[PDB]
Each structure stands twice: as structure tokens, then as C-alpha cells.
């Protein structure tokens, strides 16, 4: 007598195996997503790192302007003292000079003889970067995973 | 005799089929995450696209201020030349005026006759947008997937 037990045993092992083949894909698919997302997030983080730099660059552009103005104001006031237009002992003029000098800020540098030069921290390349406004976070995408089907073992008709 | 072989073949087919119902959901669930997350990332990207523009707007607010002060200083200095207070050939005054005209920047526009007008790029709407501070990236969320159950074939007690 021919024992058919092997035939049925051939069937079930396929349903497991194909199912396992699905599962192993699915985990990889999860990994395929998780690896990519972190790359996107970090990319966005890099863009944030760009943006903050511009702010700091812009802040330097503020400070240079503060240096540009106040010294030029002081240079005028001292000049009014220099040509004898206003009394050098004019208390209001001296108070103005003191108040201006208090507001000089960091980038202002005394060079000698009541003169202050602006040591521009935001250089020409800084200004070009600010004015260019070439920020682009860029596009983002994530994958789509194909459907997976579980196959029953085709009973081979031994005709 | 009653062939029970039909029964077992029915049973395994259920276990396979029910399992497939999980798998096809799970893939969809994966896809359900992915297409959602891309919408979040791009949305976040849009928020960055807002912030950069704000910086650019603020940059214009800086530039106009450079035009606002320097020309006015020149307007004062030239007036001192016009009112006969200081010699027009005063070399220090001339150097100061040259310095100021070098510090004008792009926003200032010579209107002729030693006078400059500030062509304000950051208009009233620009200033209102800056002062508003109404930026909001908003909230983000993702779905929660429930457990999936696979069912064994209920052996129909033929009572």
C-alpha cells in the first residue's frame, strides 16, 4: 500500500514558507522605511543648521550697521568741536558724545584720535549669501511597498 | 465511507487565506504611514520656506534702515556746508561725506542734488508680517494600527 502521508506533508510546508517569505520581506520593508526617514530628518536638520547661520550672519550685518552709524555720528560731533562751531566744553555736546560712545557696540574699534573703524564681521561673501536667499530644503519622498501574496503548494497531478 | 480528505484541504486554505488578509492590510498599513509622513515632511519644509522668507524680509528691514540713517547724516552734513558753518573745502568734512556715501548701500537712490531717497523694499505689509510673529508650523500626527487576528477553520460539527 502506497502511503499518501507525504503528499499532504508537501502542502503545509509551502504555506509556512511563503508566509515566512512575506514576513522577511515586510521586516526589510520596515527597515527600508526607517533608514530613509532618518536621512530625511537629518537633511531637514541640516537645513535648520543653514537657516540659523544666516540669522547669525544677519545679526553681524546689524552690528556692522550700528558701527557704521554711531562712529559717523561721533565723527561729525567731534568735527563740530574741531572747527570751533560748538564749544568743546559744551556740556550737551559732551553728553551726546558719551551717549554715542556707550552705544558703539562690539564691532566698533577705536583706531586713534577720536576715530572708530567698523571691523565688518559680515564680509562681502556674508552679504552676498544673505542677499542671495538661495535656501532650499529640497524635496522629500518615501517608498511604497508592493503587495505580497502567500502561495499554496500546487498539488502536482502525477498523470 | 465518507472522504474526510476534503475537510482538511478546506481547513488549511482558510489558515492561508486569513493570513493573507493580515498581510495585505499590513502592507497597506505600511503605505498608510509612508504617504502620510511625506505630507508631514513637505509640510515641515513649507514651514522652513516661510522662515527663510521672513529672514529675507527682515534683511530688507535692515537695508532700508541703512538708507534711512546715512543719507540723513549726509543731509545734515551737507546742510552744514550749505549754511556756511564749516568750509566746503574742509577736508575732514569732505572725507566724512565720501565715507557716508560709500556706506549708503543699494537701497538708497540718488534723487539728484546731493540728496538720496530710501526706496523701501520692505513695504508696510512686510513690516506688518514681521511684527505679527504669527508663524506656526502646526501639529503633526500619525495613525495607530490595531492588531490583526488570524482564524483557524471552525470544524463544522455536522449535528
Amino acid at each position, epitope marked *: 500500500g502506497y502511503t499518501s502521508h507525504g503528499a499532504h506533508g508537501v502542502a503545509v510546508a509551502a504555506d509556512l514558507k511563503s508566509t515566512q517569505e512575506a514576513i522577511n520581506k515586510i521586516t526589510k520593508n520596515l527597515n527600508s522605511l526607517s533608514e530613509l526617514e532618518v536621512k530625511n530628518l537629518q537633511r531637514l536638520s541640516g537645513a535648520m543648521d543653514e537657516i540659523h547661520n544666516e540669522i547669525l550672519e544677519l545679526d553681524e550685518k546689524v552690528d556692522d550697521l550700528r558701527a557704521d552709524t554711531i562712529s559717523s555720528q561721533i565723527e561729525l560731533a567731534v568735527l563740530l568741536s574741531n572747527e570751533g562751531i560748538i564749544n*568743546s566744553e559744551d556740556e550737551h555736546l559732551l553728553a551726546l558724545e558719551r551717549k554715542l560712545k556707550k552705544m558703539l557696540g562690539p564691532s566698533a574699534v*577705536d583706531i586713534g584720535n577720536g576715530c572708530f573703524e567698523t571691523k565688518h564681521k559680515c564680509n562681502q561673501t556674508c552679504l552676498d549669501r544673505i542677499a542671495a536667499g538661495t535656501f532650499n530644503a529640497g524635496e522629500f519622498s518615501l517608498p511604497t511597498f508592493d503587495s505580497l501574496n502567500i502561495t499554496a503548494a500546487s498539488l502536482n497531478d502525477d498523470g | 465511507g465518507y472522504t474526510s480528505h476534503g475537510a482538511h484541504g478546506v481547513a488549511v486554505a482558510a489558515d492561508l487565506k486569513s493570513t493573507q488578509e493580515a498581510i495585505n492590510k499590513i502592507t497597506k498599513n505600511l503605505n498608510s504611514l509612508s504617504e502620510l509622513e511625506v505630507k508631514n515632511l513637505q509640510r515641515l519644509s513649507g514651514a522652513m520656506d516661510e522662515i527663510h522668507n521672513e529672514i529675507l524680509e527682515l534683511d530688507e528691514k535692515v537695508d532700508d534702515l541703512r538708507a534711512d540713517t546715512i543719507s540723513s547724516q549726509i543731509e545734515l552734513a551737507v546742510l552744514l556746508s550749505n549754511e556756511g558753518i564749516i568750509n566746503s573745502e574742509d577736508e575732514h568734512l569732505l572725507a566724512l561725506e565720501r565715507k557716508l556715501k560709500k556706506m549708503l548701500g543699494p537701497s538708497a537712490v540718488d534723487i539728484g542734488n546731493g540728496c538720496f531717497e530710501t526706496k523701501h523694499k520692505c513695504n508696510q505689509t512686510c513690516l506688518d508680517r514681521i511684527a505679527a510673529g504669527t508663524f506656526n508650523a502646526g501639529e503633526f500626527s500619525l495613525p495607530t494600527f490595531d492588531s490583526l487576528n488570524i482564524t483557524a477553520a471552525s470544524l463544522n460539527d455536522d449535528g
Partner: antibody
Amino acid sequence: QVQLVQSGAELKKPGASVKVSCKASGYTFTGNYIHWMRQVPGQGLEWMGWINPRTGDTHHAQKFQGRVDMTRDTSINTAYLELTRLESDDTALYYCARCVFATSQFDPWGQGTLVTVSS
Amino acid sequence: QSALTQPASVSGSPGQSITISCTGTNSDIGSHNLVSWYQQHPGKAPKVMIYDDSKRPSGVSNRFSGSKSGSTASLTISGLQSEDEADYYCCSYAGSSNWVFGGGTKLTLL
């Protein structure tokens, strides 16, 4: 005549302090900065600092920070440079000079004041 | 803060033309047009000779001509004379409200 008259030479023991005066004449005392230099005999000039007479604002070289003070009396048109915690290397001729608006011109120079640090 | 490099000493015959160089960094000589040249005699305070890289104070002879190229200032004395034998110092603004003197050069006559 535009002139600077420095004080006479001084001798101090180590660790002591010295004060050198520089009287200005022939020009507006507040219309220039006063710059202080030192030169050891037979050696080169060493820049120390400057002072604004108009406001009293000063700058010291980093080498001399914490040991040198600069002041002025505008009534007599005089500057003062005080060096404390004197050492042997400080023995030198010290000069005051007038510096002009937006110029690298230290003009006129004082005759110099010899300071000697010895035990 | 590095003292500006100057030659230790130079020599020349009467009537000749000589030049003394003073090299520094961009931040001091190259970046600023505020280099000056000062003469000093024994037992005498320094006398300014050139300022702002070319400018001649009143009373200074025409023979003393200042110049600058890059981070290197130069003083050319044409037609060398007896009175020219002396020590000579370059002094430049070095940023951050600081001024630096050169190592000096002893001009001697042969």
C-alpha cells in the same frame, strides 16, 4: 609752539610705582590723543597705549594690562602715565606723543623721561 | 603681538639713494593705510618723517619718500647726507586700537 614737556627722570626700587607727566602746549589739549611709548637704551621703541584727553578713554597694550594707568588734568593740559609693580625690564626712556585726527602722525614727541628700576 | 620686521642696519655712501623696508601682516600694514616712518638720533627723541604711507610733514626734506605695497612699507632716501645717519622705525596700526613699532634699522654712512 606745539610742544610736549615730560617730567624729569625717576628711579624706583622693584615693585614700586612711578608716575610720568607730559604737559601739552601750543595746541588744543583735547584735539588729539596722547600716546605713550617706551624704549630701552640701545633698543627699539615699544608702544604702550593711548589716552583720549577729551573723554579720558584709554587703550593699553595687552602686555601692559593691569600695570599701567593713564589719566589727565585738562586744566593744566597735562597727561599722566602711572606704572605700578615696577621691574628691571621697565628701565627705559618713556615718551608721550600727540596723535592727530585720522593720522598715523605722532607729532611732536616729548623729550623723554628716563625711568630706572634697580635695587 | 609681532613686531614689524625691519632690517637691522643699512649702509650707503653720501649722495646715494637707499631704501629701508618694513614687512608685516595684512591686518596691520596691508589692511590699513596708517604706516609711519620716524627718525631718531642719539640722545634725541624720535622725529616723524613720513605718515599715512606717503605724507610728508612740513619741514621734512623732499628726499624722504614713503611707499606701501601689500603688507610691506618702504622708505626711500635719495641723495644720502651726513644728517641721515640715524635709527629709523616703522610704526603701524595693528587693529583693535593697537599700534606696533618695527624692530628698527640703523642707517650708517661709509
